[PDB]
Each structure stands twice: as C-alpha cells, then as structure tokens.
DNA sequence: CAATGAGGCCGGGGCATCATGGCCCCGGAATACGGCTCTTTTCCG
DNA sequence: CGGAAAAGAGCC
DNA sequence: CTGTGCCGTCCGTAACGTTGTCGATTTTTGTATTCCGGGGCCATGATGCCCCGGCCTCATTGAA
DNA sequence: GTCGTAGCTGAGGCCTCAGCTACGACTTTTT
C-alpha cells in the first residue's frame, strides 16, 4: 500500500440552496447576487466545487470561468437530488479508468468488495449505535441483541454468495438499525421527530426525521461524485448498485462503509443540537419538507464535520473527512491495479 | 504643631504595599506615570475628573451619586479625594475605580484597596454618614466588587494610620522590600534602588533581572549657528534659513541644547518649559553658559544632606579621595586596552603603569584635599603625555596631542581643541542628569564653585573623563571622524568645521547609549543610564543608606 | 494556515485603479477608502504583485502592502476607529 | 431526433410545454420538439434556462456548449443510466478483437473506396484524360479485395501503409488540373510533426480541424470518444475519432483543401515557410476555416436512409448507428461509402 | 524596546483632520495620503486614542489603527510600492 | 539697594542689547531703555522677543530674567551657570540652621502682620451710622499682642499667640463688610484654613491666599533662594515654608482686602458660590473674575518699603526679597521689614 | 622597601557560522521495438 | 547481355 | 507666531451608462525508454569571534 | 428578470496645501 500522499486542497465547495441566486463572475470574483442584490461572493481561488439545489441561476461566463477553472458544478434538485454534473472532457488517464471496466466486468472482486462495503457499513452503523443511541435508563448503551444482530448481517454480508442477497442483508440491516434509529435522536424521538424507518426508502418524505436522511445521503452521493471524479475514477459503473438515472451507480457503492459516519452521525447532532424541530420543516408538499433557514444551518453544518480530522488505519495519520475520501480512493486504483491484494477498509 | 498635616488617602494604600515605597510617596512629590498609572489617569480623567452632584448637607430621601469630593477629617488625621459615592438618603457607599480585571484573590480585592474603602467610609462616617461597606468598580470590566467594613479592616486602617505618622516624623526611611515581586510593579526600584541598596547595604543579594530604563527620549542638538526653532504643535520644526531642516517630536525630546547664535520662537519656549524639559544654552564652543528651572527641583532632604555633608570636609575629603582614584584606575584601563604600537611598544609600560597609580596610594594616603589635588593633576598630567600616542597609532597628520596645551581655554592643538570640546559639553550631562535627582552640582565637596562649571558636575566627572570624553576623542581620530582637515584655525586656537562638529557630536551621542556592565552590579548598562544610577546613590550615601560608594571602576 | 492582509491603494491612474479594483476587489474586500482587506496565504499573494505590478506603474501609484498575521488571531491588531474591521473567513457561501 | 443548434449567440432558450422553444429578443423563433430531440449546441454566449437545462438533464438529453466562432467550452451531462450503457457497450466491445476488426475492416474500405471517388471526379489533370488510370483505379479495387480479408490490424496497417504513400505520389494530378505555381504537391509526407509543403500546411491543419468534430460528435452520445478499436490508445490518442474519421478523412479534409485551391483561393504568398513547411496568414486561415465551413455545410444525402442534410448532421448520425450497433438494434454497422 | 505604527486616516471632518493632523502630524510622520507612519512604544500610544477619540467621532471618521512590531526589524514587513517607506528612529536631531 | 527690575509689558516688543543698554523696540521703534545699570530680573510677556545679545548680556551680568505670559501669567526664569546665588543657597541652608535667624525673623514677621491687621482695622472699619471708629481696646489689645510677639520666648509660643492674634482679628473681620453682615456671605471665625473652605468668605480668602504662595514663591525664587527651606514654617511635606514665612504680614496688605474689595463692590455674590457638604466653591466665572481683582490690587503703587518710589505690590515683593538676601550674608541687619 | 593580592590584559581553546563541494535525484532529450506488410527504382550473375 | 527478380530502397 | 479655520485645489474613494462587443492553442500523433545532466541538497570544512585565565604588573598594607 | 458585462463619464464625497485674517488658551487642590 503506502498511499503516502493525501490530497491537501486549496479550496472548499460553494453552496446555493436559495432558488433565486444570481452568481457573478467578476474576474476573480464569483460574486453571488440575489434579485439584483448581492448576498455574498467568492474569489475563484478558494472555491473547490459548486452545487445548484434545484433552480439556482448562473452565467455561462461564470460557467466559462468555472470550466476555465475546472470546478465541478452539480445542477441538483432542491432536495439535493443529484441531477446534473460536469466533467472537463473526462479524465485524461484511461489506464486508471480501464482498471475498473475490467474489474467491473469481473464479478468476483465486486462480491469481494460489495461485501466489504455493507460489512463496512454494518461495522460502523453499529459503532454509531454505541455512539448515538440516546439511552437514559437501563438504556445508556445499545442492546447487544441489536448489536449482535448487526454482527449477523455483518457475517451474512461477508458471506454473500451473490450480489443480490447482499442487498437483502443491507435492507434488514437498514430495517433493523433504522428501526432503532428512532432512539438515535434526543433520548429517542422527542418533538414530533418519530423515526418512521418505514418511510425510509420512500421517494417523498412523510416524516421529520425521515425528511432529513434522504438529503444528506442525496448530498452524500453528491460529494462522492467529485470525490471520485478526483483520482481518475468514474462513479457510474456500480458493482452491484445498478446505474439509475441520477444515481451515480458506484458512488452509491462506496458510501456503505461511511453511510453511518457521515449521515447517521450528522442527523444525530442537529437533532441532538436542537436544529431539528418538527416545526423547522415544510411539513407537506412532499408529505414532509424543510426550510432554508435550517437548511442553511445544515449545509454549512454538513460541511464542518466533513472537515473533522481522524486517522487512517494504515498509518494513523489524521486527515479530514474530505481529505480521507481520496486516501481510501487511491487504495482502489492500486487494488484496481492489484497493487494491494487486500482492501483496507477503515471500518469504525 | 505643624509638624505633620492630614494624610491623603491615596497615600495610605501604598503603606501596606511597601514601607520604603510609602515614606517616599507621602512625605513629598516627584511622581511619574507607569503602565498602571497612565491607565491610572486615562480611565479617571474621562469619568472621575469631571465632578457631579454635591453631597447634600441636609439628607432625607434622595440618591447620593456624588463624584470628586474632597473630605478632610481633622480628628482621624487624613484627607481624601473620593472617586465616587453610591448612597440612598443617608447610607453612603465609598466607590473607588480600579484598573485591572477581578484579581485572582479571595474577594477580588487586594489589601490596600480594602483599607481604601474602609477609611473612606470612616471619613464618610466622620461627616455623619453610614457606610458599613464599600465597593470596587473595575472599569475595565465594570465588575463592581463590593467590600464591607470589617472591624479589623478599620483596625488595620487605624494601625496603618498610626505607623505612617511614626515613620514620616522619624525621617529614617525603611529598608527595601526583601526581593519582593512588588518591586516590578511598584515602579520605584530605579529610585528605590532596593537590591542596589540591598546588595550595597551588605544585605548581599544576587541580581535577578532589574526593572530597567524606558519612557525617555534622546536630547536635541542644535549646533547650527543660524537655526530658527518654532512650534508645529507637539512638533518642533527646526528651520534654518526659513526652511524646515528637521522636526523635533516634543513627546520624545529629552534635552535641549543651543550652540552659538541659534534662535527659537517664544511660544516654542512656552512649550518646552511646560514639560520640565531642560534648555541648556551653551556658547558656540560648548562652554555651559546657562540653564533653566521651573520654580526649582523641589526635593530638599537630599539638598540638606548634601550641604550638611558638603559643610563636612571629611565627606568632602573621603568622597574626593574615591573620585580621582576611580578616575586614574580607568585611565590605566583606558591606556592599556586601547594600547597601540608596532613592536616592543604594543604594551603599556610597567614604568608608565608604575607611577600613574602610584598616585592612587598617595591619593589614598592624601591627608587632605589639596595634596589630593596635586596627586590628581600630576596623574592627569602623566596621563596626558601618554595620551597622544593612542590616536591613529601615533598622531595623524596634524592630529597631534599635547599634554601641556591641556587644561586651558584657547585650544592651540587640534586634538587639544578636541579634548576641549569633549569635556566642555559633557559636564552638562552631570549638570543636567544630577539635577533631576534633586542634588546641587555647584556645592562641591571636592571642587570649588565658580562660574560656568558646577562644583560637583566637576566632582563626578572625575571618573568619567577617560571612559567617555577621552575615548571618543581617540576613536573619532582613530576611525577617521576627526582629522586635520576637520580643523580650522582662529584667533583663540584650534577649531573644527560644521561637518565634523556634527560628526563628533553624533558619535558623542552614540557613546551615550552604549551598553557596558556595572562592575559591582554586573548588568548591561548604557552610558545614558550610568550617570543617573550614580546620582541616585549619592543622595543615599549622603543620606547614609549605603555605607560606602560604588566607584564604578572598570 | 493562512494570512490576512490589507491594502492601501493610493493609485495614480483610474485604469490602474480598475484593474486594481477589478483584480483588487478581485483580491481584497473593499475595506476603507484607499483600502481593501485581504486574505491571502502562501500562494495567491504572489499573484497580487504579479497582477499588481502591471496594475501599477511603480513610479506614481503608491500603495503600502499590508501583510498581516496568520489570520486566526488578528482582532487584537485592529482598531478600526469608526466602521469596525472584519475579516472574511473560510466559509462556504451557502446561498 | 435532429440535434438542435442554437444559431445566433444572442437569443434566449426556454422550455415552454414539452418544447425547448428558443427565442430572440421577446420573440419566439424556433421549436425543438423534445420528444424527438438531441443535443443542443450552446454557442458563444447564447444560453438556456435552468429549467430547460434541468429538464434536459432529467431526460438524458445532452446540452453542449460552444464559443462564438464555435469553439467548445465543456459539456453538461445527465447522470442517467442510458449513456453509460453505450459506453459500457463501447467499453465492452472495445476489447473484443473480433468486433474491433469487424469494425476495423469496415472503415478502411470506406476510406479506400472513397479515395478513388475524389480522384476521377476532382481529378482534372487531363493531359489526355483526367480519368484516373484504369490500372490505378483497379489497384484500390484490388486493395479493397486486400481489405476484405486483412487478418490483423497489423495486416490492415501494411495494406493501408502501402495504400497511403502511393496516392500521395499522385495527389498533384488532382490538385490544379496540373501544377499550380508552388501548389504542386511534393509526392511525399503528410506533415507529421513539422509541415513540409504548401500542401503540408493545409493537410494537417485541416485534419486537426476534422479531429475536432469526430470527438465532439462522439461525446454527443453516451460514448467515451477516447477508446478506439482500430488505433490502440497510447495515453492521449483520440483513436475513436481517428478510427472513424477515416471515411471523411478524404471526403471533407481533402475536398476542402482542394477547393481551397481548386478554385484558386489559396496561393503561396498566403503562407510563410516559417520554421517548417509553411504558415498561413490568419485571413488565409479565416478563409480556409470559412472554406472549411463551405465543405462543412455542403449538402449530402442518405446516411442510412434517404435524407438530404448537411455534413454536420451527417457527421453526427454515424455514432448513433454505432451505439445502435453497440448491442443496439443495428446488428451490422452501415458504412456510408459514396 | 519600541513599536512602529502606521495610521489610515479616513476622517470625515476637516476640523477633526486638523486636530488629527495637528496631533497626528504631532503623532506620526505624513506617510501616504490617508496615512502617517507612527513610532510608539508602551506609553504615548495610549495618548493617541486619548487624543484620537475626541479627534474623531467614532461614527463617521474611519481609521484603521496600524500597530506594528518592535520597530527594529520592520523592513521585512513593508512593501511601499512607489515611494519607499522608512521609519524615523532614535536619533538626536543635530541641527 | 542696587537696582530695580524692568517690566517689558508688550508682547510685540523687540528687546536688544545696546552695549551696556537694554533697548526696547516695539515696531523697530525705541520704547524705553534699562541701560542694565539699575537693572535686575527682566520680565517678558507672551511671544515677546529678547535678542540673544541682550539675553546673554543679562546672563553675563547674572540677571535672572523671567518669563511671563502676555497677561503677565508666569512661566519661569533663566539662571546662569554662576556662583551669584549658590552662596545665598549655601548661606540659606547654613543660616537656616540658626534659631536666632529663625526666631528673630519669625518675630519680625509676626509683629509686621499684627501691625498691618490693626492698621487695616483703622483703615476699612465700616461701621457706618454708629461705629465709624474701631475699638481702641481691640486696637490696644492688638498693640498688646505684638509686644508679646516681639518677646516670644520659643516657637511653640509665637505660633500660638499668632494664631490667637489671628482669631481675634478675624472676630472683627466680619465687621468691616459693607456696613453690616454680608447675608449670604457666611464667615466663621473658627472654620478657617481647613482644607475644604466652609464659608464663602473663607473661600475668597483661601483662593486669594493660595494665589499668594504662587506669587511669593516665584518672587522668592527670583533670587537664588529656596522657597522650600524655611525658618518659621515647617519645611517638609510639599509646603514652601519660606514664602509662607514672609507672606505672613501681607495676607492683610495683599490678600485680606482683596476679599473685601470683591465683596464690597458687589462683584462676589452668593450665586457665585456652590455648597458641597463643607465645600464652598466659586464659579469659574467668579474664579476668573476673582483673579481680575487680584491683578487690580497688584497694579496699585505703594511707595515706601524703605525707599519712597511708588512701586506696585508685586514689584515690592522682590524689594523685600533682595533685602532679605542682604540680611543673609550680613549686608543690612534686622531685616527692615516693610509694615504699614 | 618590601609583602600577599587587585586590576587588568594577553592570549589562546572552543565552535558556530558559512560556503563551497559532494551527491543524488530528476528530468529531458533522444534512440531504439520492438516491430509487418504492401508496395517499387539501384544493386546481383 | 538484356530479362527479372530481388534488395533495398524510399517509406508505412 | 501657533495655532485653526476656512479656502480653495488638486489629486486619491468609490460606483455607472454607454458602446464597444469578443476571440477561439500553436505547424499531429510512435513509442518507450534511458541516460545523461542539472540542480539542489547535504555534509564537511575552516574561520572568526568572544571569552576567560594565566600571566603581569603592582597596589598598599604590612612591615621594619 | 432579455443577450451580459467590460469600459467610460458625470457628479459628490475625502484629503491636503497655500494664502489669508483673526487672535492673545493657561485657574486653588486632588484622582
């Protein structure tokens, strides 16, 4: 292994949740304007990525410059539903991307790794339970009956014989864990935030707590796009997550290891930080929706934890969550070059 | 009788901080401004300088929030100037502002401040008011820290009331605080000279790092004989021939000198006097001709000490015997370390070093001042014949020194012009800095008062001719500051051009700040701070605090 | 690991002002009259005097470069007598 | 559907109903018919709404971007599961040596067959007859017989390697009905690294111009334009354009340079033999690119079925058939020889 | 042991300018347009905002206080693009 | 005596040296001449001009030239590097060690002040209508006390009878007002001289007295003598004991009537006063109007300290001072104190 | 006239400081499969 | 000794 | 004569209403390799200063 | 929400200087 180099990063992404932005290239200034009134601006130097939640306006001159500075704009839906993206005439390496065509056209390493993803998902869905189970009496720690059950989809995932059984391993592991996610939040669902983990998976949300996961993950996928558009990878060739339109099929595959760390822990802070009040929501128009006032809280919020520093298991060198994204990605193309026989996982 | 008046309350807090501190403050004056005391005013003069409501003589029902009120109870023995009072009807609260945060001490108030509110309450109680407690308002945090007049705080107050009177009447000033960390914050150590004195008073201490010079500027030179000086506010614009040649920032101008017919505007003079800034007129050549005072340097105890000790020939004789021997010792130290020949002469002769300091033992065994006098002049003389050789490795073109054109008015050797000036301007430095310590340079134990040269500015200049005035001549010759082309002739004797006159002055200005070490006290010391440390102990030795004098023999 | 900076633009050509302003508003936030506040680390600083050495002739335009500390503890070093000074920090523009 | 092109870099593109109706200043000017629609060519500063865009991104309909003259700023892709399939089809068939060579043999005959069309009909060096020598005409027919079974991509090379230099030893005889002063082709190289001839100043600039469209028209569908069957990629080779610009390699790139001088527009003084073969003036370069447009918009018909269109719409139609041949409905890829 | 400073006077009253200038030329050497250069240690600094808090109303006059290091190693921290910046140091005016 | 100081009143004046002469030019036109023969300390007003030649000349002859504002408001002097007055400085220090010098002159001051007070009692006695004359018993009792003062045995005795002498005179100080009691002008015979003045009349006296110490100390320091080294008053604790030693007879002649002048003309009024728990303070309108009374008294010409030449009060201050410096070093014995 | 120690200088051992040379790495510039076959104007027999 | 290939040439 | 108060008088703040419009790579493409050179870096070398004490000179008290 | 934005002109607001006319500060002792 020895993925010696971590990606440092000069800039950080820009966000537009307001449906009436107006974002200006003023030479170096990526000014934003709002109904002919500026709200903020960005020098183009410190900007890493651009996203447009639903109808967010822009000038091609800025596109011209944004492409001129080769900064990935993601046209998104309002709930962060990933719907548009741009890449600068693709990645110049074929040998890297050809690693995966042959590897994806190969099924074994898919099962060898699709396993290692929800195995890496359950291994740290569970650790978040010990971390984010809001228990107060005879309850301060997660139930070993639940914990060992996660150790069971753990082994059932790790002994997936096909790439569709592995799916069922996750859903019950989702069904079960999210059955228990209802205690993940403020001593268990308090102010109207009852975790109906059955409205989990529903295209539109009924529930307060079931209207938040579906965007962070809808966001989760979004960064993986650029986070995988970095090392030369292409996030459309899902090993087991069959490409859906809008679903970057392989960007969907690799978030299983960190599905819990990044959305199951941020939801359990904003709630547990009183950011999630069922009254902070657009309670309908999807059965349940939310407001920019708190949205602007979470989008910056979702950004900050993303800059928390933790170690990577192989060298213990602490690297922020964005910066640890590319490290685990290099392990791929080298495992995709076969350089590392095993695949280190950073299950937590 | 009128032997002791009412004590200001600002003088009682200092009593429990340090006694050597307090006796110096209360009994009289000479105060300056520090970190805490510049802040001491800046917070104050915006709020506490401006007065407020008068304290009602008939108090029934109304808020008492008076400010800047002067109390004086003739029975307790004290006078106050209250910061503020918070009172309802007739129960008043002493209110005093402070400077820092809440101190990390129990109650958030140090002891002197605790005494402050209580006696102030005792004074408020005196005029028929109920205080029973005070407060501390830290305008930095405005954290009102109340205090209640606990009886022993009255007890210390009265105890502090009584000891200060006993000490001040006695007139014997208490010893320094024993290596106290109050010294760094007291802002007296340079005038306290505590472990200066402590180590000097055989309470042999080992120097920590001292509380050392800041807050002063460098003097102003006007050697241009056609300069016209005028005010630009706190700027002092040096225009010569009606054009701004230089500007002098009054805030950092320490001394004023005038050589030859140099002019200054009247309102400028109006300014300089305001900041106790000396204006030392000198003729065009460095004869210290006159000076200025502002109703005098007010200290008297040192004055009476000096006269009483100057009225004493023994102090006149004992002190004078240390002067020239400290002078002659530095002469040999100067001759030897600067000694510059070619071969078999690159060392000072023992024969030369036989007799220079054979004068010391004779000066040590001088039975009186007059025999002490001849020993010096002979030693000074034998110094001079050997002086010529140490400039430019032998006299440069025309830069030839003469021992016997020395000590006389019209210098008819160029370097004897150079030696004439160096002494001429430098005696002022004693005359100026020794003035600040409240002493008298014309009342000489050793020398005699006569016009133009102060009898003690001469006395203390004895040791320091070789180190300062004699050395700068050599270097100015040696490095090339002064050569023959730097000299022009005249009716009187040898003289210098304007350009070199800058050159010797500024380098002379540079000799003044050069760091050396005190032989007794072993610390980096500049020359602008050699003399003033020296002036201070004289008062103390004239006061008798230090059993003897540190001659500063280097 | 950054630095904040300021600029003191006393420029002696309007064209140079614009390309200053253009690049300088492109560089620093308009802070005071002749002043922007600037936030620049190792890198782009070099791109000012890159930009501002053509942006100016060095004869007549005069600016002091106001190169400041690591931008995390700069509030001690400010006294903006009227309108208060304020850095713009490492945040993602959210709207 | 037909790939709609936004013509003037000033108008306004919007989505009214199920139609991307474009508009000039407060006036409807054209209708897109999203149901049968394709890529929209966004020229210099002509723009669309983030509702037509946000609908096109939904329906797997590409939105491409161009500069004023037409230079390509980057594209805007839909994150669908339709375009990657063809890329997967592209990438699945790419390593398949059969369909590789099955693809491979199909172009080389199309390139070879079309060459003798440019000769003899735009051979006008009569002398006695400009009709390309019958022995010369049959050699390519023999060479096409060679091409019918070239059992390797290296045999294909040796066949075409033979088949290349020879008619660059005959190029002057199509040039000017004779030899133009200076514009007489040295029967020699094709300006590989340096130009070497007045012809070599037009016959790598033009190909560089052709390599453009056979890359943009390929990313115009779900095809990575950079993974080729015939030409083995070498870390930066637009082989997919290269393997497939071959039929139009003579058909546009050479009719343009010919009628750049067949009518006599380009002469020796236009270019300067500076640090190489020659170096055209920009006005000459503008006229040549303008001349490129005349061939670029020259009318043509029947890519696979009778329809008369421009070369552009012809230059795009092939790749869709290609993907349709990439396990799509077409099992046999049409070659479109003229 | 001193500090150099600068001032960025963007004052919004001529009277205040003078008493500034008066006290500010009395404080710092006229350095650039809205700028003097200043040389102040522990002490007199306090006397500026003493002087300049009346010298200004804090509403409209705006100045950044430009409080600099120990005045002995300040040349690294200067780029005066046109006319070069220069402190005035601890010398005795000799004429 | 030796000579008199020259007062260069004009701020515009341009003062030069004409050899021995000290010429005054106003607009390059001569004003007057001092000739530096009968000259002494030279007084100059705000932004006036003294040429260095005349400057040096006075410094050459060791004239202690002072500096005054245009209003005449003082700043300070200019003393040469001469032994002219250190001798006085060393006598004064050495002679202050003498009780007789202390006791004699202390007696000389007390007798002068007692005579001046009763001299005023027979001057401004304002009992119009019924009491045009002061009580001779009051006058004679004062004549009695000065004899006791002349024969004061020790210092603790002279001060007590002096303070006793002061109180009884102040018992009648309230009497010489506008004809009767100055209602609204409270005057107590007992709350005097305490640091907060407890009366409006106490305030006028206290302010006038304080502006004497500054008057005398500068008049004292005009000659090379220490105002802080006194014979009769206690020297230490910030008190100039010597000016206070000599000003004692002139609280009547320089200060006491000043309160009476400013009150009997109606200038001082109770609205010009403020009361604060034992603090009776004026207004600055009153304070600066009050000082104007002081200068009006200081410009009046009195003829005979010992010689009859109609000098102002302030120019008589030096006359007494120089005479004292002659009792020091023994030039004129007994200090012929000027008393009225 | 002569004693046991002060003052101070001479007089170097100690070492940091700089700057150049050794080394290593890196980068570019060029040469060689490596390497097939179809075709086409001076030779060998 | 001219053919005629075969060599080697240009190049791919 | 020292302000400070206008008195202006240009130059140093921005922001804005016009018509420019702009602007576009570049002279392919066989490759892969290795070596050679440059540069930087690193290590070691000597040298200069400051320091410190032995040594000298030499008090001056001690001593006859 | 019509090309959008770069670039130039005016009108006002800061910033300083040269050139004029008024003027004529100074306040007890204490914090």
Short mmCIF file of N, CA and C (backbone and C1' of nucleotides) in Angstrom, two decimals, chain C residues 9-10 12 17 30 33, chain I residues 11-16:
data_model
loop_
_atom_site.label_atom_id
_atom_site.label_comp_id
_atom_site.label_asym_id
_atom_site.label_seq_id
_atom_site.Cartn_x
_atom_site.Cartn_y
_atom_site.Cartn_z
N UNK C 9 -4.45 51.47 -1.22
CA UNK C 9 -4.26 51.80 -2.62
C UNK C 9 -4.36 53.31 -2.77
N UNK C 10 -3.23 53.93 -3.06
CA UNK C 10 -3.22 55.32 -3.46
C UNK C 10 -2.65 55.30 -4.86
N UNK C 12 -2.43 56.14 -8.95
CA UNK C 12 -2.40 57.39 -9.69
C UNK C 12 -2.79 57.19 -11.15
N UNK C 17 -6.51 51.80 -11.32
CA UNK C 17 -7.48 51.55 -10.26
C UNK C 17 -8.41 50.42 -10.62
N UNK C 30 -13.49 45.51 -0.23
CA UNK C 30 -13.34 46.95 -0.10
C UNK C 30 -13.44 47.34 1.36
N UNK C 33 -11.44 53.67 2.43
CA UNK C 33 -11.35 54.44 1.20
C UNK C 33 -10.28 53.91 0.27
P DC I 11 -3.55 67.78 -10.07
"O5'" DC I 11 -4.35 66.49 -9.59
"C5'" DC I 11 -3.69 65.25 -9.45
"C4'" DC I 11 -3.60 64.84 -7.99
"C3'" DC I 11 -3.78 63.35 -7.76
"O3'" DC I 11 -2.95 62.89 -6.70
"C1'" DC I 11 -5.45 64.52 -6.60
P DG I 12 -2.66 61.32 -6.57
"O5'" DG I 12 -3.75 60.79 -5.53
"C5'" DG I 12 -3.87 59.40 -5.25
"C4'" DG I 12 -4.73 59.22 -4.03
"C3'" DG I 12 -5.67 58.02 -4.02
"O3'" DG I 12 -6.27 57.97 -2.73
"C1'" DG I 12 -6.94 59.80 -4.16
P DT I 13 -7.39 56.89 -2.32
"O5'" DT I 13 -8.60 57.08 -3.30
"C5'" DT I 13 -9.30 55.92 -3.72
"C4'" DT I 13 -10.48 55.67 -2.82
"C3'" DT I 13 -11.53 54.72 -3.39
"O3'" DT I 13 -11.31 53.43 -3.01
"C1'" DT I 13 -12.56 56.73 -2.96
P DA I 14 -11.57 52.28 -4.08
"O5'" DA I 14 -12.97 52.64 -4.71
"C5'" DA I 14 -14.01 51.71 -4.70
"C4'" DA I 14 -15.22 52.33 -4.07
"C3'" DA I 14 -16.45 52.32 -4.95
"O3'" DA I 14 -17.32 51.34 -4.50
"C1'" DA I 14 -15.77 54.52 -4.56
P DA I 15 -17.84 50.23 -5.52
"O5'" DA I 15 -19.10 50.91 -6.21
"C5'" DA I 15 -19.92 51.77 -5.47
"C4'" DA I 15 -20.64 52.72 -6.40
"C3'" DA I 15 -21.42 52.02 -7.51
"O3'" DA I 15 -22.63 52.72 -7.77
"C1'" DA I 15 -19.88 53.48 -8.46
P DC I 16 -23.56 52.27 -9.01
"O5'" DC I 16 -23.02 53.15 -10.24
"C5'" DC I 16 -23.68 54.36 -10.58
"C4'" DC I 16 -23.75 54.54 -12.09
"C3'" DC I 16 -24.37 53.37 -12.85
"O3'" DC I 16 -25.10 53.82 -14.03
"C1'" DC I 16 -22.20 53.70 -13.61
#
